[PDB]
């Protein structure tokens, strides 16, 4: 009845859902990347554009294998990797260069000079973001500045910029060769560029004046809401041709919607090499005083007000496990690392400050390295494994507490997906440390369900939010509850904060 | 023939060895015996399990001695070296113990010590006896026994109580105990310098010291302090395989190790490795009270008209314990050989530093609130970095103690001899020479501690005439034996610099 496009960094895919949130079709084909110098990442635009409509042609032929068709489906939404900068010609509808994916770090030079300018300190309170290498403001500028090929398209009047969501929507309505050429972005992606006032949801002339981008010389994408039938046009050519595009959400905002994290204080944590945390702060935007990112969680328009969020990341969660295995020869497999941590009753007094490349929000300690405290002849691999897992939960709490202070709303729930969210012990400890229930849903493609939720509300599939989350019932092991005395959990977190402070100042030059 | 026998009564084992004139042993026997741990921190021994193990070693050893065609006629005399500070109480008329021995690492005196410190005349003890109040000295053990054992308190009151370090106990019995012509209740200056009952410059007892502990020299028979090399004060073995063989040497074990290395010049030091380290530093005829927490004791009292020699002492709690930790606790490798190999497998510590303060840090740092702390871990850290850091920790703590020794004494470090345990790791000691900037001497003759007692005995009986005759004879003798510095002083000083930073960043971890 509804469906979803989930294009990202490694791959595309196209799932199609029902009124209960159950995915009844999928098709996913990968694609590879370049590293043409340390810190450089690129991607020919058409590759993933073609990648995605390759997915829909197979995904939707399987779809009809049980007698369903487009006429049975109302609209489709889009969720996409963020911060990726694309550039093309007003005239052609064709790339005037290749793309700069978010991992790229060629802008470091540019960022360090931008950070010097006097009015660089006024940006954060307006776009909600720190000057960095990920934002699209600097990827685009670097090209206007450095690139030999298409500085003139800026100068001549024929250049158009877009995030991935816009490029897809562009050609999927018929490129420049269509009745109504659709060149737009949703709020959750434009919050990433550093061109948008977070309070206005509209391009700010002060932020463009900082980077020197003249709107008369460049064609930017019209910012629209994440749920709208008219504004995303329709699908140009394919099995879904003529079906309305009605959804668009950035990568990690869409996941929150799929988990139905619609209330202030609701957070989610995605584990991996590290963590990525997202915190729903409500209808009023919040600028972090702790180095966290402020973004748009979702903008369903339709009369309702936009909901914002705070963003936080941790460099080391799963890397801590790999370290104990490959670097220390504890075990040759991650499961056995949990077994070594369920080995022992407690951390034995051990604390592992996993600051391999320093520490980040909320601490911001650049002169620390990995530091292991509390070792005795009684310490064993179990204790160190247990502490390594605890390091992840302490840094999670530290950020969540920071978003509590930033936002003025206390934490109410946390949902978690990712390799180390599989550790029952790790997830139980988070509930003990955070004093709040830790949710772990079986459903996997949350990040694509959000784009479909948005398209559905635009089209009457779901009446409201309170309705979206009643429909999902259709689709220890799912929820972990605080079992430790609140006093013992404060004691653990205090030894950890103590260890962090005593880690400061290791690297002297 | 003419050989010299040596009883080495240790805290875990007893052994009896028989040395020729050039310090090489030809007969040996060793016995691990029972150590009792009745509760947390307490450590006891049956005083007869120590005598018995010694006697068994004498039987076993000279069985081997005879197989070579020798006998007692070929043994001029016998030397004794023992675990220090281990306390024994016995009835001065029956000769039978009144309580198990309390071995030196016992902790039961923590309350007695913490209170004695309060008594406010304690700051004077260090300059008289060379030691501060610890759980280790015999005084507080003897006191705990009295304050908590009616059996000894009675014998005390009745005037029939005798205390003695293990050396006194042994010589008392091997001469026949009571019930003998020429009974012997004597201790050597080295062992007597560990009780806190004796004045270090005097080499005699101090009434003010025993006034501090509530001990009167009439109600208790103290062993007679005698030279470590006396032809007649130690008497002779009465029965057994060595009946009639004179005893002429007696030295605390750590002093005997220094003598076995021929460390008689001021500035010569030695390090005995084990679970931890014991370092001794020769400082000449004048005793030197430490300002860095080191212990001042007697190095050796060889008589024959030569002034006693004193020493400074330090100890590290974690040297071999660190290797054991990496192998068993972290599964790195199952033998010290492979830990070394893993340490040589990489070029350097990779920026890793391991403050091996499992039970806090002792001299000269005196940090009680630190625990084992490992710095410098990145995703590029491998087991050889940590292995390297673990061996380096022992060397840094060694250099720390030796630099305190130089400052206290005024003598530049002239040499360092090494025996036991981690001594066998060429990279550990190569690194030690690198860090301290002096050559490191490792002899291949392993029973260095047993040798020092035989030296004392032989000097009292003419096996060696003077002390330059002794090191001449030893040299009458695979692995290397000398490690020379290889490192840029700058890099060596950077490594020690990072260590001292890590030590300082490690304090304050433990809170109560």
UniProtKB/TrEMBL annotation, chain A:
<dbReference type="GO" id="GO:0019563">
    <property type="term" value="P:glycerol catabolic process"/>
</dbReference>
<dbReference type="GO" id="GO:0006641">
    <property type="term" value="P:triglyceride metabolic process"/>
</dbReference>
<comment type="pathway">
    <text>Polyol metabolism; glycerol degradation via glycerol kinase pathway; sn-glycerol 3-phosphate from glycerol: step 1/1.</text>
</comment>
<dbReference type="Pfam" id="PF02782">
    <property type="entry name" value="FGGY_C"/>
</dbReference>
<protein>
    <recommendedName>
        <fullName>glycerol kinase</fullName>
        <ecNumber>2.7.1.30</ecNumber>
    </recommendedName>
</protein>
<dbReference type="InterPro" id="IPR042018">
    <property type="entry name" value="GK1-3_metazoan-type"/>
</dbReference>
<dbReference type="InterPro" id="IPR018484">
    <property type="entry name" value="FGGY_N"/>
</dbReference>
<dbReference type="GO" id="GO:0046167">
    <property type="term" value="P:glycerol-3-phosphate biosynthetic process"/>
</dbReference>
<keyword id="KW-0319">Glycerol metabolism</keyword>
<dbReference type="GO" id="GO:0004370">
    <property type="term" value="F:glycerol kinase activity"/>
</dbReference>
<keyword id="KW-0418">Kinase</keyword>
<feature type="domain" description="Carbohydrate kinase FGGY C-terminal">
    <location>
        <begin position="268"/>
        <end position="458"/>
    </location>
</feature>
<dbReference type="InterPro" id="IPR018485">
    <property type="entry name" value="FGGY_C"/>
</dbReference>
<dbReference type="InterPro" id="IPR005999">
    <property type="entry name" value="Glycerol_kin"/>
</dbReference>
<comment type="similarity">
    <text>Belongs to the FGGY kinase family.</text>
</comment>
<dbReference type="GO" id="GO:0005524">
    <property type="term" value="F:ATP binding"/>
</dbReference>
<keyword id="KW-0067">ATP-binding</keyword>
<dbReference type="Pfam" id="PF00370">
    <property type="entry name" value="FGGY_N"/>
</dbReference>
<dbReference type="GO" id="GO:0005739">
    <property type="term" value="C:mitochondrion"/>
</dbReference>
<keyword id="KW-0808">Transferase</keyword>
<dbReference type="InterPro" id="IPR018483">
    <property type="entry name" value="Carb_kinase_FGGY_CS"/>
</dbReference>
<dbReference type="InterPro" id="IPR000577">
    <property type="entry name" value="Carb_kinase_FGGY"/>
</dbReference>
From TrEMBL, chain B:
<keyword id="KW-0808">Transferase</keyword>
<dbReference type="GO" id="GO:0004370">
    <property type="term" value="F:glycerol kinase activity"/>
</dbReference>
<dbReference type="InterPro" id="IPR018485">
    <property type="entry name" value="FGGY_C"/>
</dbReference>
<dbReference type="InterPro" id="IPR042018">
    <property type="entry name" value="GK1-3_metazoan-type"/>
</dbReference>
<dbReference type="InterPro" id="IPR000577">
    <property type="entry name" value="Carb_kinase_FGGY"/>
</dbReference>
<dbReference type="GO" id="GO:0046167">
    <property type="term" value="P:glycerol-3-phosphate biosynthetic process"/>
</dbReference>
<keyword id="KW-0067">ATP-binding</keyword>
<feature type="domain" description="Carbohydrate kinase FGGY C-terminal">
    <location>
        <begin position="270"/>
        <end position="460"/>
    </location>
</feature>
<dbReference type="InterPro" id="IPR005999">
    <property type="entry name" value="Glycerol_kin"/>
</dbReference>
<dbReference type="InterPro" id="IPR018484">
    <property type="entry name" value="FGGY_N"/>
</dbReference>
<dbReference type="Pfam" id="PF00370">
    <property type="entry name" value="FGGY_N"/>
</dbReference>
<dbReference type="GO" id="GO:0005524">
    <property type="term" value="F:ATP binding"/>
</dbReference>
<keyword id="KW-0319">Glycerol metabolism</keyword>
<dbReference type="GO" id="GO:0019563">
    <property type="term" value="P:glycerol catabolic process"/>
</dbReference>
<keyword id="KW-0418">Kinase</keyword>
<keyword id="KW-0547">Nucleotide-binding</keyword>
<comment type="similarity">
    <text>Belongs to the FGGY kinase family.</text>
</comment>
<dbReference type="InterPro" id="IPR043129">
    <property type="entry name" value="ATPase_NBD"/>
</dbReference>
<protein>
    <recommendedName>
        <fullName>glycerol kinase</fullName>
        <ecNumber>2.7.1.30</ecNumber>
    </recommendedName>
</protein>
<dbReference type="GO" id="GO:0006641">
    <property type="term" value="P:triglyceride metabolic process"/>
</dbReference>
<feature type="domain" description="Carbohydrate kinase FGGY N-terminal">
    <location>
        <begin position="5"/>
        <end position="260"/>
    </location>
</feature>
<comment type="pathway">
    <text>Polyol metabolism; glycerol degradation via glycerol kinase pathway; sn-glycerol 3-phosphate from glycerol: step 1/1.</text>
</comment>
